Each structure stands twice: as structure tokens, then as C-alpha cells.
Amino acid sequence: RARADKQHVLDMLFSAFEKHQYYNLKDLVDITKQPVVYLKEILKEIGVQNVKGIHKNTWELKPEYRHYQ
């Protein structure tokens, strides 16, 4: 089903995370005009969230169990 985008979308995340350890939702959509709700679900399973000074929305691929490399 939409898992094709999932595997292909992770490649885009690694490229984006390759330039910086943190990325907000707005930055991720510019890299992929795919529905955020779809991106958030992928980030929800392996991603993480962090609020900072001005509640900066950031996300990080949780590497705790990425057997895939």
C-alpha cells in the first residue's frame, strides 16, 4: 500500500538528517510535499519530538533499534 512511500520517504529523511540532527515538521514537508499526517506516523514509530525555548518543533529518527542501515 502506501508503504512504498514509507521506505522511499525514509531515504529522504536520512538525507535530511544527514545535513542536521534536528528537523521540524515544516522543514520535512519542503523536502516532501506528502501529507504531514503521513510523515508524522512514520516519525511517530521511529521519530521523536522535542519542544525548546520558543517551543521549537524538532524531530529525530530514534536509532535505538534501527537494525536497518
Side-chain angles (χ1 to χ4, degrees), residues 33-51:
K33 293 186 176 72
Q34 294 164 68
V36 298
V37 304
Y38 182 79
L39 296 175
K40 290 191 61 31
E41 289 167 342
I42 294 170
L43 296 169
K44 185 162 179 289
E45 290 182 1
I46 58 165
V48 177
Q49 177 57 66
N50 323 268
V51 288

Side-chain angles (χ1 to χ4, degrees), residues 51-57:
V51 288
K52 312 184 71 273
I54 57 176
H55 303 180
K56 302 176 191 176
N57 318 298

Side-chain angles (χ1 to χ4, degrees), residues 11-59:
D11 290 328
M12 296 290 189
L13 300 186
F14 281 105
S15 61
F17 280 107
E18 184 178 341
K19 316 302 191 180
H20 285 124
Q21 165 45 216
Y22 294 99
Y23 276 82
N24 71 336
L25 294 175
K26 181 172 277 187
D27 290 346
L28 290 173
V29 288
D30 191 353
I31 304 180
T32 51
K33 293 186 176 72
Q34 294 164 68
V36 298
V37 304
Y38 182 79
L39 296 175
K40 290 191 61 31
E41 289 167 342
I42 294 170
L43 296 169
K44 185 162 179 289
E45 290 182 1
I46 58 165
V48 177
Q49 177 57 66
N50 323 268
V51 288
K52 312 184 71 273
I54 57 176
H55 303 180
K56 302 176 191 176
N57 318 298
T58 63
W59 290 82

